[PDB]
Amino acid sequence: MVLLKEYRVILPVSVDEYQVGQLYSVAEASKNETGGGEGVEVLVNEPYEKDGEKGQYTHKIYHLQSKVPTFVRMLAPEGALNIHEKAWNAYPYCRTVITNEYMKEDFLIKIETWHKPDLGTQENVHKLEPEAWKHVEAVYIDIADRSQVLSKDYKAEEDPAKFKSIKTGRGPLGPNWKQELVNQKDCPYMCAYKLVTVKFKWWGLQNKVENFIHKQERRLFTNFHRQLFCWLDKWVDLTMDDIRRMEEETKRQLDEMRQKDPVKGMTAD
């Protein structure tokens, strides 16, 4: 037994800018959560060959102490957690698997994403078998709706409902932002269908932890995409190679941030 939810993020950007946007934003975000000995450590970032499928592979470590609640922290005597994240990014499809050495296969967060040029209208894009599909909650994340942000997390500068791109004129995103999007030609949009699979088989904490992760993943996909957008002007002119170099700089910066910096980031639920 295992808990499955698909997050549907509609965005006012093209499947092709998104490829770059995301990649940039993963790094910015990584940096905003690293410090105090917590956050992101990159170990591997390189192209791969499965033979027929080509794309980029990463192996990261997420370091967690205080940014998670007491009851998670307490799963380990050292009061501290490393979770390993191996990802195969074959944009427009990505498969991400988070595991924990100390736990065999009783623990798993897996994210499977398909980026598609529509408005989230596709049921079961991931072609799951029908019984399993029956148990999937589909959740829409609206990057405009401020009710969807945790108060602690809100920032007017990370708010799409308040941002206008100077480089492209997109924004800011009013309550109808969607309906409007449908009304005009020179308006791209995609949906990220992120299927998240959570497994945590541990006596008496399974439902509790499973649900906590889904709520934390959802918080992330919400701030992240808010930020992706409010960050348009920073990545909208960027090349893949402009990105791979960022990635390199960022591997070292994170290694320096996590050591020399205060705790920053999201603070946990």
Instruction: Quote the CA–CA distance of 4 and 213 in Å, as a whole number.
Output: 11
Token pair for 206: 């399974």
Tell whether 96 is in a known binding site. Answer: yes
Range of the domain at 57: 2-269
Q: Provide the H-helix boundaries in 231-269.
A: 232-235, 240-260
260 Cα distance to chain centroid: 25
254 burial via Cβ count (<10 Å: 0-12, 13-18, 19+): buried
Tell whether 50 is in a known binding site. Answer: no
Tell whether 250 is in a known binding site. Answer: no
CATH number of the structural domain spanning residue 11: 3.30.530.20
- Domain total for the chain? 1
> What are 192's strand-pairing partners?
9, 115
221 Cα distance to chain centroid: 5
Tell whether 121 is in a known binding site. Answer: no
Nearest Cα to Cα of residue 29 among 15, 17, 13, 42: 42
Tell whether 58 is in a known binding site. Answer: yes
Q: Are 141 and 9 in contact (CB under 8 A)?
A: yes
Phi, psi of 83 (to 5 degrees): -120, 140
Tell whether 82 is in a known binding site. Answer: no
Experimentally, the structure was elucidated by X-ray
Q: What distance, in Å, lies between the first and last C-alpha atoms of the chain?
A: 24
